[PDB]
Design an enzyme around this catalytic site. Structure first.
Site, short mmCIF file in Angstrom:
data_model
loop_
_atom_site.label_atom_id
_atom_site.label_comp_id
_atom_site.label_asym_id
_atom_site.label_seq_id
_atom_site.Cartn_x
_atom_site.Cartn_y
_atom_site.Cartn_z
N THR A 1 0.84 -1.23 0.00
CA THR A 1 0.00 0.00 0.00
C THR A 1 0.84 1.23 0.00
OG1 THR A 1 -1.68 -1.16 1.18
CG2 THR A 1 -1.92 1.21 1.18
N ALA B 1 -5.44 -5.19 6.75
CA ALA B 1 -6.53 -5.07 5.78
C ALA B 1 -7.92 -5.27 6.37
CB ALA B 1 -6.33 -6.07 4.65
#
Lengths: 235, 240, 238, 241, 233, 201, 244, 230
Positions: free
Chosen positions: F1, F49
């Site tokens: 990310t 996540a």
């Protein structure tokens, strides 16, 4: 641990404990406020008659944080709890969203609190009634008047004290557009409205003003005196 | 003025009226007799079948508790069923706790002080159900006990609770009590039930029996099912 | 002064009476009429639904609780929904733990011990609702009236509700053609048992009649406003 | 302020005017219900126990009906109240006896057992929402230091320490007979207790019992184990009259 | 007196049949389910004219597609309107979808007949909620409105009147609605408010009207829309 | 990310990549790593996540409750503050997240940064993520407050293009958002390869 | 049961509180102990129970209770309750110190006690604390100050208010005699023995049947004196001659 | 379980109805005298049972609180025993935290504190035992009395129980401030001798003194000794 259901429905839909609180606010001081379009203003019944009072601790005019402030009317010791919890949750609402806390939200908290004491097991719903005045982020000098049934109304005079049905019909008569100026006609309307009921402001009335999110200023005997004088001169 | 309506208030002569009002509340319900003999205890319950809509065993009134003690009940079936299932939990805590299978005297004293200690408070009502127990271990003897809504528990031989216990105690007293081998008295139970049932009006006396004995070895069975067509042949002893 | 047995699920009337949980039985006599019954194979439930309004779903009575143990409420409705969230939740708990269908007898017995607690203690009204539960366990499809007096009945072909005694006295004298009489001719035999509680002028319309079927090789199935229309026959003129 | 009642004087265990809370004497009248009547015997070496017990109909099991409970291996008791409230009281006395032996070592002596059940009976008659349960505990027992003792806590919690007082039905005639028949010997040895124990019953209520209806529970200094007697030895005790 | 959990010699509870009263007290609200929406209106009964009429909240939006309309003992609903919206966003949170109207109405009506004197911790309720309301909402089944009682009884409704005008306005509404919206149910419902009139000829200061239409989410009507409708009558 | 956000005189760009690792094996090449809590604000995700997805999901619930309860659009400082309150009172429990809370309100473009430790700071620009400091470098070379819309978009595309080129735990696609006084819009769903052939590296 | 509860927390149909104004009539049966402040410190002036010899020694009396170094309180009404609450409020005083290292400005204390006493009349179903006790104190913020409270819950700065019986002998006469600007605490003693010299059945007003106590200072720290015996025999001969 | 509403409440006159009934139940109690003396006190009381049948060495009315503090009552029987239980417990809390025997004044503070909440707090009726306290506490002896209200006063002499007006007037007549040892016992004996309902038996009275060496009950051979020296 007392668990008797006090606030119960009688016949003909009459919730007698709440109307007994309605006489309990009918037998108090005579609070009054005016939303004066840039200013707001209060006034209640002076004290009695100080003689041996302390004027610092005979305050029907209370301050919540800086802008919102209220004038209770009835039982004068169950009110101070609602003052304290209003100040506490008002600081919590400064903690979360960090605003000059809107007057709508804190009066919804007061009305929701008193409605939560019309529900719980055995705790006698309050005998107070408020005048939540103040401002918000953009002027808007909103006034609110609660009720022992927890119903708040956003009205503009709400004289809700003891001899104040005459004051609210007077304020129905004499508040259209002449009090849109800065302070003088509004405060003159308030001190005229309470001089309808009792007597001179050198012993009786006391007021408080609030201007555009600063300077919650009370009026020492001076203010009241001046107001009375002006009223007499006009009448 | 009004010394009634609360179990925590005595009479002015010492008589807690919420107990004796519960006692007549089992006197307006049908009989359930229990007869002890040397090989075990035989129960028999009167049934007062209201409509044809109820099937056989619509309401059990001979419950069992611990695979050997029984529950001939009299009064409100809700309250009797409640203390039946907590008697099940009580013998459950005994067998789980002490291992040894529960002797009946301790269970009758335990359920007895449960339903007694439940009559000391205005925050509860007394129970409205007389009931009786009964079993035998291999060295116990045919122990049965009977418990009032007051909470008192006595060991009996032929106790009878219900509406017609004024009639029912006389025949059990004239029946030879001590030395017969339970099969005959299963048969003889019908003679008591058919005598004490003094109606034909919409109650049908459709009785029900259960016991514990040497034919059972410390158990319970609805009869097995054959004396229901053998003790039914004690009609005309109530019709003549 | 007048009736000191008004502070009253703790007290006893001096004859035998507990004086208000039989009055909850009055409070389900006041409720709407319904009728359930059983065959040798599958048990059925039939309910007429009162329309005390403009028009409505007529306060839908028979309820899905289960995975074949269906009910039919009468009396209060919020208290009925509380009791079937209980019955529903622990029926699913017996789906969870034991991984079998929960048998109908233990179901109705433990709710018969759950609605029995406020009859016992202080200041708590009984569950004023008369369930008419019906389901198909391992043996034949049982049907249980239970009551606010916490005293259920292993019955067959029971009717409870407003003037349901006439439906019983039709249904008592027509038990001989039970343990036969398949679904198409059984539910006709239950609707003409329901069509006596009506005030002598009224069709069993498709609006107010909602029925439920449960038994061998079929889920407890609710027939609403549309699906009751294939069940049509009679006159009775009743 | 005498008949000016504050409402629920005869309903709740609270003070009426002029004192006299109207529940404990309503609970005293509860112990006279039916009436199966105990008398307490004190021996300079043997605290005998006597009581009368009537079976109704020869259908009760006469062995199971009794009052005569055993608290421990040194303390017996007998109670004459309503027999529903009896076994709830004797089970707590067994509980506090075994709790004393687990908590403080030695087996509990007879006095503060009766102090303790007198004290829970006090908290019955102090708090509301519970009735003071109507049974009084004639309970005997011997400790190492003193002689045999006997005690009775009432349903108000006032244990005294008695020479020998039995309350049941006909309490006043019994204590009058015992008072007239103890001033003869204030030293009061009387180990046999043949002219005192049964004769209080047979002179109060005049049955001159066969050995069935009387239950006798002795303790002796030579053998402090609480013993309930049978028709053989009580039959010799009766033909000794 | 007697307590709250007691049954009455008529047949019902005391506090429930007393909670059917204090619905005759209070303002009147009406709602009409149509085939392409549901309209709600309430004459919120302003007392004095010295004041501000646009803060008497009697049309409250539970979600974007559920709007309620309470009456009776006002401001007693705010706890169960709070439970309605908290349950709504709990449903959208845990299930990632919209709701029905019988799930919010199922969830609120469980709190109606849930009170008592001696129960669990004193955050419970003593009196029943003396406020009758109805959730106008649109679903994937259809637009619909569910009339609640203080008894917890909720019913399917397409034309329901509450408040003091629960007999005359309901009987008038019984004969004037069968078909569909086509923009004129909202103008044939304030006409029923026009027959109801207590203090003032129903201008855009004393009635609050809001519709829920399947295309949009809701529409709380502002002043010029209202007096645009009032000009047409 | 690798997320990224920067405000200027037309709202604020929020851009992010679209890969979601599992230590070394990677799960998806298309992950919606920008949560649209309402059509006025946004919120990103930067690790853990299910943690970040649950807490901006729950932030969407709480801010919608604020919308219903006080009939106003929520201020962005309120949403970032209450997020910092709840994930503050799960501090030390292995919770690991980090986000922008951008979005126009009645005072400003917003852009607060709230993470697992509970920093809760305002900002002019940020880029939180695994590598993400690459993004800082290239973004802070071409950033100015006096940008117009198009080279701000190219500043974000080149910014997390290089931050996804150099880093290993990033890549996939790039979505981009430009919120201002109407709500968020979407201007891109481009992947890394078409940016590589678009810009020759 | 709901038949048994006294129902203390109920409004009257006239709106008032039945169990609260019954406490106000409990003050008029037993109660004395006015308080006067000056530019200098503040004093209580009190009455004991009766003439009954049979009383050996009070360290402080049953009337004046010490609370901090700079506060004290006096008590009317039911003496069994207030003892409890004064120990209760004493706890409050010390824990303010534990929270702030300040000597607790007295309005905080009066506000706290009035909040908990209001909490006993708000809910719980209990009887309210039947005592209209009052307070004297000093803080660095304000001057010498006395507050006065009642079983209802409200309070105030009540510069010369007395409690108990004879409200007119004690106190309407004081609101014709107190000079609000300057008072000169020796003359406050003189006014106190004036009012107590009018509110008594006897002229024997020595410290057998009076309990007067002053609060003063020296060099910053406050001094609470209970006015030991012979000072009362000084002030009782300060008339010599007349007072009214 | 429980009530959580006070049954003690205010009259429309403005007084406690239950507490004056408690002082009535005290005033119908057994008479008991207590004499503060220049070195030590004497707390006499009267144990008249129903018959000559009971063990007069079984129950006590003089009984100490653990160090040097005895307390004697007049009124209800077992409510006294509860107050002895609570009083011993409070004295042992004080002893385990401050490592000295409790000052008598503080024990009367805490016993009057526990008797107050039974004038409130959930269905409990007040005790109706106005027990009186003794104690040597350093230098000079103390004496108190906790009424069932919760008040307490210290003095030189008192009586309580039956006809206590005669005890207070009679002790007001015969008291000297130096009257110190066994002369106090003498006048205590001739205060119970005033009524007694007859014959002044040593088994029907018991006294307790606080002669600077701990409170101690007097053996029955010592009271009869001074009953021989009347």
């Amino acid at each position: 641990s007392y668990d008797r259901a006090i606030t119960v429905f009688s016949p003909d839909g009459h919730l007698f404990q709440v109307e007994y609180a309605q006489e309990a606010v009918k037998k108090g001081s005579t609070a009054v406020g005016v939303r004066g379009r840039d200013i707001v203003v209060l006034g209640v019944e002076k004290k009695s008659v100080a003689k041996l009072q302390d004027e610092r601790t005979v305050r029907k005019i209370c301050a919540l944080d800086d802008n919102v402030c209220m004038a209770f009317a009835g039982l004068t010791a169950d009110a101070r709890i609602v003052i304290n919890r209003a100040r506490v949750e008002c600081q919590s609402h400064r903690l979360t969203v960090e605003d000059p806390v809107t007057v709508e939200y804190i009066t919804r908290y007061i009305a929701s609190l008193k409605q939560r004491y019309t529900q719980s097991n055995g705790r006698r719903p309050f005998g107070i009634s408020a005048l939540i005045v103040g401002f918000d982020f953009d002027g808007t000098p909103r006034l609110y008047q609660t009720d022992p049934s927890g119903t708040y109304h956003a009205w503009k005079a709400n004289a809700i004290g003891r001899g104040a049905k005459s004051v609210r019909e007077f304020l129905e008569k004499n508040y259209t557009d002449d009090a849109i100026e800065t302070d003088d006609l509004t405060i003159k309307l308030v001190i005229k409205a309470l001089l309808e009921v009792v007597q001179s402001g050198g012993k009786n009335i006391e007021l408080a003003v609030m201007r555009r999110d600063q300077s919650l200023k009370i009026l020492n005997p001076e203010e009241i005196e001046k107001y009375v004088a002006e009223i007499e001169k006009e009448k | 003025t009004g010394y009634d309506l609360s179990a925590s208030t005595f009479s002015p002569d010492g008589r807690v009226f919420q107990v004796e009002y519960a006692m007549k509340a089992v006197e307006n319900s049908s009989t359930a007799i229990g007869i002890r003999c040397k090989d075990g205890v035989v129960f028999g319950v009167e049934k007062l079948v209201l409509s044809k809509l109820y099937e056989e065993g619509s309401n059990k009134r001979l419950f069992n508790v611990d695979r050997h003690v029984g529950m001939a009940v009299a009064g409100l079936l809700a309250d009797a069923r409640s203390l039946a299932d907590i008697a099940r939990e009580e013998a459950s805590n005994f067998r789980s706790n002490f291992g040894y299978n529960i002797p009946l005297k301790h269970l009758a004293d335990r359920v007895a002080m449960y339903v007694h200690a439940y009559t000391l408070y205005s925050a509860v009502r007394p129970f409205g159900c007389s009931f009786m127990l009964g079993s035998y271990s291999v060295n116990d003897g045919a122990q049965l006990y009977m418990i009032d809504p007051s909470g008192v528990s006595y060991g009996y031989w032929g106790c009878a609770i219900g509406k017609a216990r004024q009639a029912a105690k006389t025949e059990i007293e004239k029946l030879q009590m001590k030395e017969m081998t339970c099969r005959d008295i299963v048969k003889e139970v019908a003679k008591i039930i058919y005598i004490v049932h003094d109606e034909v009006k919409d109650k049908a006396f459709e009785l029900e029996l259960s016991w514990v004995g040497e034919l059972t070895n410390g158990r319970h069975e609805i009869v097995p099912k054959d004396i229901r067509e053998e003790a039914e042949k004690y009609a005309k002893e109530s019709l003549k | 002064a007048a009736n000191q047995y008004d502070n009253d699920v703790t007290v006893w009337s001096p004859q035998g009476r507990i004086h208000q949980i039989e009055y909850a039985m009055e409070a389900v006599k006041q409720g709407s009429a319904t009728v359930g019954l059983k065959s040798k194979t599958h048990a059925v439930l039939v309910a007429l639904k009162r329309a005390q309004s403009e028009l409505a779903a007529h306060q839908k009575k028979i309820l899905h609780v289960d995975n074949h143990i269906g009910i039919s409420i009468a009396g209060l409705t919020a208290d009925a929904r509380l009791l079937c969230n209980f019955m529903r939740q622990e029926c699913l708990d017996s789906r969870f733990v034991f991984d079998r269908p929960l048998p109908v007898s233990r179901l109705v017995s433990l709710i018969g011990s759950k609605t029995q607690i406020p009859t016992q203690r202080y200041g708590r009204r009984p569950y004023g609702v008369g369930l008419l539960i019906a389901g198909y366990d391992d043996m034949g499809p049982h049907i249980f009236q239970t009551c606010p007096s916490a005293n259920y009945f292993d019955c067959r072909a029971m009717s409870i509700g407003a003037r349901s005694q006439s439906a019983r006295t039709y249904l008592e004298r027509h038990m001989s053609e039970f343990m036969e009489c398949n679904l198409d001719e059984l539910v006709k035999h239950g609707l003409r048992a329901l069509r006596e509680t009506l005030p002598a002028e009224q069709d069993l319309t498709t609006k107010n009649v909602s029925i439920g079927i449960v038994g061998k090789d079929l889920e407890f199935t609710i027939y609403d406003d549309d699906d009751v229309s294939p069940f049509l026959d009679g006159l009775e003129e009743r | 302020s005498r008949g000016s009642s504050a409402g629920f004087d005869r309903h709740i265990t609270i003070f009426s005017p002029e004192g006299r809370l109207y529940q404990v004497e309503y609970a005293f009248k509860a112990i006279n219900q039916g009436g199966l009547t105990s008398v307490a015997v004190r021996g300079k070496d043997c605290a005998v126990i006597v009581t009368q017990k009537k079976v109704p109909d020869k259908l009760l099991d006469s062995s199971t009906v009794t009052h005569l409970f055993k608290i421990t291996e040194n303390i017996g008791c007998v109670m004459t109240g309503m027999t529903a409230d009896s076994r709830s009281q004797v089970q707590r006395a067994r509980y506090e006896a075994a709790n004393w032996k687990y908590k403080y070592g030695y087996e509990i002596p007879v006095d503060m057992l009766c102090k303790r059940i007198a004290d829970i009976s006090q908290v019955y008659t102090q708090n509301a929402e519970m009735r003071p349960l109507g049974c009084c505990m004639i309970l005997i027992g011997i400790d190492e230091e003193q002689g045999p003792q006997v005690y009775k806590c009432d349903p108000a919690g006032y244990y005294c320490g008695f020479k020998a007082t039995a309350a049941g039905v006909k309490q006043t005639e019994s204590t009058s007979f015992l008072e007239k028949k103890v001033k003869k010997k204030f030293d009061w040895t009387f180990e046999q207790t043949v002219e005192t124990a049964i004769t209080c019953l047979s002179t109060v209520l005049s049955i001159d019992f066969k050995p069935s209806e009387i239950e006798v529970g002795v303790v002796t200094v030579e053998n402090p184990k609480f013993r309930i007697l049978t028709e053989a030895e009580i039959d010799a005790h009766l033909v000794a009259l | 007196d007697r307590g709250v959990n007691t049954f009455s010699p008529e047949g019902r509870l005391f506090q429930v049949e007393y909670a059917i009263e204090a619905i005759k007290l209070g303002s009147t609200a009406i709602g009409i389910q149509t085939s392409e929406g549901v309209c709600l209106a309430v004459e919120k009964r302003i007392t004095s004219p010295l004041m501000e009429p646009s803060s008497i909240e009697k049309i409250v939006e539970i979600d974007a597609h559920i709007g309620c309309a309470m009456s009776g003992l006002i401001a007693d609903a705010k706890t169960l309107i709070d439970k309605a919206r908290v349950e709504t966003q709990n449903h959208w949170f845990t299930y990632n979808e919209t709701m029905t109207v019988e799930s919010v109405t199922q969830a609120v009506s469980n709190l109606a007949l849930q009170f008592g004197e001696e129960d669990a911790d004193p955050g419970a309720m003593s009196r029943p909620f003396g406020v009758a309301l109805l959730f106008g909402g649109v679903d994937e089944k259809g637009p619909q409105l569910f009339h609640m009682d203080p008894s917890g009884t909720f019913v399917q409704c397409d034309a329901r009147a509450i408040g003091s005008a629960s007999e005359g306005a309901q009987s008038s509404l019984q004969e004037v609605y069968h078909k569909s919206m086509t923009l004129k149910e909202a103008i044939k419902s304030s006409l029923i408010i026009l027959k109801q009139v207590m203090e003032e000829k129903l201008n855009a200061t004393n009635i609050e009207l809001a519709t829920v239409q399947p295309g949009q989410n809701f529409h709380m009507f502002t002043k010029e829309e209202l007096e645009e409708v009032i000009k047409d009558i | 990310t690798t997320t990224l956000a920067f405000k200027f005189r037309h709202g604020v760009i929020v851009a992010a990549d679209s890969r979601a690792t599992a230590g070394a094996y990677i799960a998806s090449q298309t992950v919606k790593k920008v949560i649209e809590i309402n059509p006025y604000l946004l919120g990103t995700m930067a690790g853990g996540a299910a943690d970040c997805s649950f807490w901006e999901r729950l932030l969407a619930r709480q801010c919608r409750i604020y919308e219903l309860r006080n009939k106003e659009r929520i201020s962005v400082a309120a949403a970032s503050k209450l997020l910092a309150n709840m994930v503050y009172q799960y501090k030390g429990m292995g919770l690991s997240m980090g986000t922008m809370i951008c979005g126009w309100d009645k005072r400003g473009p917003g852009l607060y940064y709230v993470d697992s430790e509970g920093n809760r700071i305002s900002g002019a620009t940020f880029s939180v993520g695994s590598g993400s400091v690459y993004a800082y470098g290239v973004m802070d070379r071409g950033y100015s407050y006096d940008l117009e819309v198009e080279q701000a978009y190219d500043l974000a595309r080149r910014a997390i293009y290089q931050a996804t080129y150099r880093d290993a735990y990033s890549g996939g696609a790039v979505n981009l958002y430009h919120v201002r006084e109407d709500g968020w819009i979407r201007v891109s769903s481009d992947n890394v390869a078409d940016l590589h052939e678009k810009y020759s590296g | 049961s709901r038949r048994y509860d006294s129902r203390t927390t109920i409004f009257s149909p006239e709106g008032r509180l039945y169990q609260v104004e019954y406490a106000m009539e409990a003050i008029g049966h037993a109660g004395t102990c006015l308080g006067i402040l000056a530019n200098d410190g503040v004093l209580l002036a009190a009455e004991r129970r009766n003439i009954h010899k049979l009383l050996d020694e009070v360290f402080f009396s049953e009337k004046i209770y010490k609370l901090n170094e700079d506060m004290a309180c006096s008590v009317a009404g039911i003496t069994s309750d207030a003892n409890v609450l004064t120990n209760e409020l004493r706890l409050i005083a010390q824990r303010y110190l534990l929270q702030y290292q300040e000597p607790i400005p007295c309005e905080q204390l009066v506000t706290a006690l009035c909040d908990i006493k209001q909490a006993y009349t708000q809910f719980g179903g209990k009887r309210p604390f039947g005592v209209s006790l009052l307070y004297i104190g000093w803080d660095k913020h304000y001057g010498f100050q006395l507050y006065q409270s009642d079983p209802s819950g409200n309070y105030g700065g009540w510069k010369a208010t007395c409690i108990g019986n004879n409200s007119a002998a004690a106190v309407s006469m004081l609101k014709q005699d107190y000079k609000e600007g300057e008072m000169t605490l020796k003359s406050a003693l003189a006014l106190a023995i004036k009012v107590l010299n009018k509110t008594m059945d006897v002229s024997k007003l020595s410290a057998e049947k009076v309990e007067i106590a002053t609060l003063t200072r020296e060099n910053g720290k406050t001094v609470i004196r209970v006015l030991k015996q012979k000072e009362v025999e000084q002030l009782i001969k300060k008339h010599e001659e007349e007072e009214a | 379980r429980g009530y959580s509403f006070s049954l003690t409440t205010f009259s429309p006159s403005g007084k406690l109805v239950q507490i004056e009934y408690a002082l009535a139940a005290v005033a119908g109690g057994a008479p008991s005298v207590g004499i503060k003396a220049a070195n030590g006190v004497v707390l006499a009381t009267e144990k008249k049972q129903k018959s000559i049948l009971y063990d007069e060495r079984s129950v006590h009315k003089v009984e100490p609180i653990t160090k040097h503090i005895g307390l004697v009552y007049s009124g209800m029987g077992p409510d006294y025993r509860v107050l002895v239980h609570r009083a011993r417990k409070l004295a042992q809390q004080y002893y385990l935290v401050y490592q000295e025997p409790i000052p008598t004044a503080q024990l009367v503070q805490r016993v009057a504190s526990v008797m107050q909440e039974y004038t409130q707090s959930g269905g409990v009726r007040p005790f109706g035992v106005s027990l009186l306290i003794c104690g040597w506490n350093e230098g000079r002896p103390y004496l108190f009395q906790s009424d069932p209200s919760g008040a307490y006063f210290a003095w030189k002499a008192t009586a309580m129980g039956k006809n206590y007006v005669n005890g207070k007037t009679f002790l007001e007549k015969r008291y000297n401030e130096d009257l110190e040892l066994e002369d106090a016992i003498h006048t205590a004996i001739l205060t119970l001798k005033e009524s007694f309902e007859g014959q002044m038996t040593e088994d029907n009275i018991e006294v307790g003194i606080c002669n600077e060496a701990g409170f101690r009950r007097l053996t029955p051979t010592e009271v009869k000794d001074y009953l021989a020296a009347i």
